[model samples]
Target chain A: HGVCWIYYPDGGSLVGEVNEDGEMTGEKIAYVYPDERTALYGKFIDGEMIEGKLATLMSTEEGRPHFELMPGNSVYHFDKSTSSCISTNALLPDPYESERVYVAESLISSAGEGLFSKVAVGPNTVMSFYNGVRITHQEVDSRDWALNGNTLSLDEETVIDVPEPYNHVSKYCASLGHKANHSFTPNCIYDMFVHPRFGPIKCIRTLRAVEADEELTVAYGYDEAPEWYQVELKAFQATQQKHHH
Target chain B: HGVCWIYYPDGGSLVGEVNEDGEMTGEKIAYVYPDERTALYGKFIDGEMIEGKLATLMSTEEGRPHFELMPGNSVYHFDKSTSSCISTNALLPDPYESERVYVAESLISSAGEGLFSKVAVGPNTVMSFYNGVRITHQEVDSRDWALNGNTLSLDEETVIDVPEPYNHVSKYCASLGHKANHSFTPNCIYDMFVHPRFGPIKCIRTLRAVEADEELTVAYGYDEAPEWYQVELKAFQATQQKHHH
Candidate 1:
């Protein structure tokens, strides 16, 4: 009957709580915050979170902060993170607390496509009860996913860490002292779309979130790469648009 | 000057300083921590911060509680955050301490393709970082993007919040408390690609970023919604033999 917030590496947030049955009863609220962090909060009962009627002054517009529910707590809570036996005064906290939480999501492979990753091709928009933002797709021509080894670079690795709302979310997960189980697994999931020029698009490379139970490794230089079901995310935009512009 | 280790919303830690330019110094270093609310220490110089380093153990890979950079400092400092004034706990407290320290990171947005505004993305990782977790790749079955929209019940207006990681970056730009001169009119880009099952996929979509001059509206809710982004990843993979499983 308590609340928990999680911060994500992708600049999103999630908040929620679990019940005695380990069921999620409350909403897994989330929002975008300052910097590269997103704010998340929600109430959990069994294993599900809600994202409705949680606020009076809230609005559902893109580019604005809103609460949405997901599978995990992805908001960053700084006040609690710095206060728990841990300490106080962190600019931002991690998402995964020690041995308590981990990024829970599906794992999909995009190795079917040879590109490291793909971006939205056309003008795409998503409207929801939460904040709304447009995702402009980019296509990188002449870039071979094979040559890159489909690994997350240092800068790219950090980009995937993004931020979250509710302080300490980010600090907590990263502080969990383990690299994500799936550091950079190929996945077709991540934000994908078709472009007018390109035929089909999917993520061939990305930084993924692995579970604690997964085997940990440093193959990508990640200190604690994990070995279980994980989430994958692609950072930045890949497109010939940049060079041509 | 004083120094403090700042946690990045992206699960990365940086030691930043307020330099003479009234901006965070570029010397900021990023270190990925396992725990979300991990801590670090820095040297204070003339009311400024400098020299960021791992405040505790040089390396705690073996699961030992980290060591303190300044050993023997009375208070036990964990990554947990607290609201109490940090004045009393520090052994090197100055009665006239003017510089207060907290974690913060510099913000930047990368503009993808042909968009007037730089659409950003992040995870709900931290409020400060505006990181998002869920960026989705939408599936477009036909050339008519609105065929599906038209089929749905039509109304004056109905929109969903931008999903995490994808829209999270936009939130970070607004977190900076800036305002853009442009109107908030949203538009989607156009893209075409081939689907694994469906032959051709065309979409009208766009990518957006949270700019330093954008405004953020607050929405209260719990739980994060599943978000997807469109990508050309799969199409690229068809050409790679090495990546072929």
Candidate 2:
């Protein structure tokens, strides 16, 4: 559980585990500051600032910077230079850390050359859980690459090896990433976060609890090519209606 | 190759293999009409009726009714008494006949008792291609039931045996049918056709040539349950905005 406090116009702060939509969950709030050596700070939802427990611990020499009120929690460090909050860690951490959050498996196809071996999350789970990342583009000359509006640029050459047929980040993202499939009122299950170094990442937890085995999907916010089922359903409806009239 | 003709108000008719959307396709149109002994007919796009070619071969026949120009097709016999077109054959035919169009297999889950084992079609095929039926409900009173306004009722008691986890048409339709996941602009891959006994059935082919392994999707019209993906994405966008500004 993680606690995120959002402040109202007044002095009131809505405190709970907050999602990308600002909705609170039953998960309790537990703010775990970075390790004691980090120069981190905390801020009130109303923009009030204070030295984080890290600094306080150094002075008091007793209180630790860890809170154990919840199980899976994330940290948002206040950026003093920018006067805002940034995620303390990348959406997808090291492989060892990601294994603690969600599993990544290959989904192979049987027929033709169709291999939809993308990564997916739980069929029955809550939202905003952080899913791990595939790759971060850092060697391109321009920042023209983006998925669902999250731009990626080349900062340096890559040494990490990607698998075949998915050696490119774009291919991996398209096949495995949580994409935006827009709807008027959608039940968006995951939120995407874009970091300069990390490209775009999705929250591992779901925005809502899903039924077991339901496909994990998200709104792309843009239109996708029209699929076949719609055309057939429309025809079915038309034919059915002819009899009704 | 099979051919279907769709007529426009103008003198021109689009001649090609048409999917349920009435759209032309590159895939050869194959029409395996009912057995030759049936009193059937065929009509050009302009609605000029003919007794068909099969009857012509059986001398002593007022031209028994069948067409050879098409290899595998369906007959929507015009119900003169009702003034509407009804498929002479229920979409769900015998098991052996169905394998010619699509295959049905169970989609199992790993973590829990989640058995989406509902049948699905091509791993990478177009939509509306008949994925087959899960249940054909019988014993329900009234012809009031339908998908998207199509109404149907059992004309007689059904002796058809249904498999486990699905004894009635209602459960089968909900679990197996290709439903509309409505969008103002959707990639509707399939169309549903409702019969007096067979509930809604999709076209035997796709409205268009799909990517090798594309998932068949359709629009469910207006009030579909929001999928989990949208809810999560919305939250992600909201949170990203907060930090962006």
Candidate 3:
């Protein structure tokens, strides 16, 4: 994105440059360099710099660039006038990526991997978001991604898309909010929590007290708890047959 | 992205491919065309396939592809064995994109473009979403997107980032939720709404009666209404003195 000041007709002044005629002009305006074909964090598709293999960096409106659009207002730079796709990671640590939480094979026999907090957590404890691609209702409608269980619908028709860790790459980059396997008798709750930085993100909260190294599960809230009947019942009978009698 | 059926150790089967070890093989699923390097809707970043311009199409879990993931459950195709970046529009169209709404130079005098609904609306009429890239709190903290006013925080640390239409590309494809200019005494309320398909999304709801062709305004709950002094006052006084006794 280009670095320059722009005047809006509404008596507003913005940090990036626009054409004299005041149209997009397709001129990117965050922090841009003549030598680099780069993508800014908030531009082009779901506002992510991953994919397209461009070194994802952003700049302060004042024009100093930072890594991964990261905070700390820290000024960093790409080796400019250079050509290369920068495959990178977030600089400052991300809390939601996990805080004492671990993901592993689930206790829910046949239910896939699960989220576990090594430390005791629960009784409505707030944790990571169900991070995924942002899809509008229109976009969801346009694509055939219904009931595969990797999606969410939000206000004003926003949908989030994610998959399980088979292993999920979304899992690779972020936390295990999406990997909280389902349970009819859940220990954690799959609910909405208002985050300070973002906003109404789907979250995993504790419904009951969780012990250390315990698997976290949510209601999944499906019309039919298919996994429960489809395979989970088999697990119940196995435990029944292995009775202590 | 790859498309196939694989079993997870959790006794789960997904329409994806994995390694012999059941780890994320980075094999893309959903659907595949032998002749194409396709990008599925829910596979990559932000769950959007806008940039990387891969003719954004997706397949049913059963594996027939459709456009922009529309709701019709329609089966569509790319001329497989062909490679071309499909500059696409969402099929079945997007409602948040606009409904009898428009954008142009603001009635707010110096404010830039504003959202105007040509049809009469009011009394909390639900309109559109503040659609943008889904940025996580960590991602926002990593990036310098503080106080830009283009970002929204949601539950579990999610943020939606959008810029104005200068004609903004974000504007080109979607509606004008971002273009609703600020007013401390706004005619519309900026709040969250739950969608049937998505979930909690930032929305524009009419607080009072809005006449046809009337410009829509929102209360931009900023801690500091900087624009009020920087330029908006001229607009206030312009009307202040133009009155007849």
lDDT by residue (tens digit), candidate 3, B1-245: 34454332212122344445554333143332221223232332222111222223443555444435434332222211101111123122234334546666777657766777757664556555554555566875665544456665555767666533313634243435777877533567666643212233566777544556666776454333355544653453243211111
Error of 1 at A29 (Å): 35
> Residue B194 CA error for candidate 3 (Å)?
3.0
lDDT of 2 by residue, A77-193 (tens): 322111121223323232212222222221212211211112333332323222222334442224332221322111243212223323233344322233222222233334333
Indicate whether candidate 1 or candidate 3 has the larger lDDT: 3
Span of ten consecutive residues with least summed lDDT in model 1 chain B: B94-103
How large is the interface RMSD of each prediction? Answer: 13.7, 16.6, 34.1
**For candidate 3, what is the DockQ-based docking class?**
incorrect
Q: A32-122 in candidate 3: lDDT tens per residue? A: 2111223232321221112122233444535534435434342222211101111123222224334546667776657666777666653
lDDT by residue for model 1 (A164-187), tens:
231133443223212222333221
lDDT of 2 by residue, B1-245 (tens): 34554433211222334456554433232112222222223332333222221111122223122333424543332211111222233232322123222222211112111111112332222223222223234422242333312112122332122233232333443222332222221323333332212332343223223232222333332213344335634554444211010
lDDT of 2 at A197: 21
The deviation in Å at residue B197 for candidate 1 is 50
Q: Higher lDDT: candidate 2 or 3? A: 3
Using lDDT as the measure, the top candidate is 3
Tens-place lDDT digits, model 1, residues B128-239? 2111111122322233343222111112232111232222233222111111111112222223321111112222222232232122212111112112111222333333
Q: What are the per-candidate TM-scores when only chain A is compared?
A: 0.21, 0.29, 0.50
